[PDB]
């Protein structure tokens, strides 16, 4: 429930119970067109692959894309068949609902627009891979994966 301006961002993996872990941490990192997106630190082997263009639409859904000089395609966070731990692929950009986490100005839960199915699906991390995490929908959230969007 927030309005992130269109722009270029670095996306840090965080959590609803610990929205600011301190120095270091991990970031959404592209490793190739059509390859799973990774969670990797802001270090030399990875630093230039961690910038994403975020863009909202009329339904209030956003896409999260990668641009890098000569990327041959225009790809971003993508899903097809969503199931628990399925990887977030750098495919044809899909739409997500970015919901602001309370007591935060720039921390967002990245959700798959899928609530009429009856479950909550959010982008999380398993190991060093961004993956889709399933959560039962209730009346109190409670430790959910989240992402700090920092405007470049």
């Amino acid at each position: 429930m927030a309005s992130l301006e269109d722009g270029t961002y670095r996306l840090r993996a965080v959590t609803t119970s610990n929205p600011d872990p301190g120095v270091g941490g991990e970031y959404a990192t592209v490793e190739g067109a059509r390859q799973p997106v990774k969670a990797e630190p802001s270090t030399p082997p990875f630093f230039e692959r961690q910038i994403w263009q975020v863009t909202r639409n009329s339904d209030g859904q956003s896409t999260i894309k990668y641009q890098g000089l000569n990327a041959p395609f225009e790809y971003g966070f993508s899903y097809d068949q969503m199931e628990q731990n399925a990887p977030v692929m750098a495919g044809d950009p899909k739409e997500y609902i970015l919901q602001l986490v309370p007591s935060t100005t720039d921390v967002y839960i990245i959700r798959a627009p899928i609530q009429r199915v009856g479950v909550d699906v959010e982008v999380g991390v398993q190991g060093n891979n961004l993956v889709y995490k399933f959560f039962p929908v209730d009346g109190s959230g409670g430790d959910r994966p989240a992402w700090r969007f920092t405007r470049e």
Binding site: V14, P21, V23, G24, G25, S42, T43, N128
Partner: protein, 220 residues
């Protein structure tokens, strides 16, 4: 204070390590603690960053997802110790705590914090204590691909700090002790980065990249 200092010349500093795919403050803490342990016992023993990443969540750290050197020093204090690199090897992923008291080779009773934003107080701390844990603004290609020389990046912030490293000395290039001054800093990106794993960062140039904004050291 001395015009130049370099704790490595004194045996306080272990070789340069590599955090690899984990965003692990743990290497900065283990470096500051290797330093104090040496000052105290005369032995240089490589400590376990994995021990810090696996076990310091109760103190408010989040492993590969990040943390604070000061909270690491707090964990050591509450835990009663920290294991050697050799006994609790680094695997660069979050795993279950496997601390063993029998293998602890270091301890601290808490830590000390350097007066914020003060380069003279940090120079004091590196001259009198040994290597100091600091946070810095490392988010620029100039630093990510730094190779040699005194690092200065006009866009460096002294407030938004994202990387924990280790100050093991200070000095100056050229002839004037007060000209072309730098902080000598140990990174944790392996020996192939920068100058054999080390970077000199502009000193007394208005707290460049925030090296003096959030410095601390363990008390042993």
């Amino acid at each position: 204070l001395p015009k130049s200092v370099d704790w490595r010349k004194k045996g306080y500093v272990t070789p340069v390590k590599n955090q690899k795919q984990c965003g692990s403050w743990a290497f900065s803490a283990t470096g500051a603690l290797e330093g104090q342990m040496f000052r105290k016992t005369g032995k240089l023993v490589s400590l376990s960053e994995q021990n810090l990443v696996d076990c310091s969540r109760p103190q408010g750290n989040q492993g590969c997802n990040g943390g604070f050197m000061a909270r690491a020093f707090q964990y050591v204090k509450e835990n009663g110790g920290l294991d050697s690199e050799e006994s609790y090897p680094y695997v660069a992923v979050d795993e279950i705590c496997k601390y063993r008291p029998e293998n602890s080779v270091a301890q601290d009773t808490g830590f000390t914090v350097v007066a914020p934003g003060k380069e003279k107080a940090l120079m004091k701390a590196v001259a009198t204590v040994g290597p100091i844990s600091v946070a810095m603004d490392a988010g620029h290609s100039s630093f990510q691909f730094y190779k040699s020389g005194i690092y200065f990046e006009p866009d460096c912030s002294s407030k938004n700090l994202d990387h924990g490293v280790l100050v093991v000395g200070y000095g100056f290039e050229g002839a004037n002790s007060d000209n072309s001054k730098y902080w000598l800093v140990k990174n944790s990106w392996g020996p192939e980065w920068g100058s054999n794993g080390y970077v000199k960062i502009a000193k007394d140039k208005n707290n460049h990249c925030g090296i003096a904004t959030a410095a601390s050291y363990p008390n042993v």
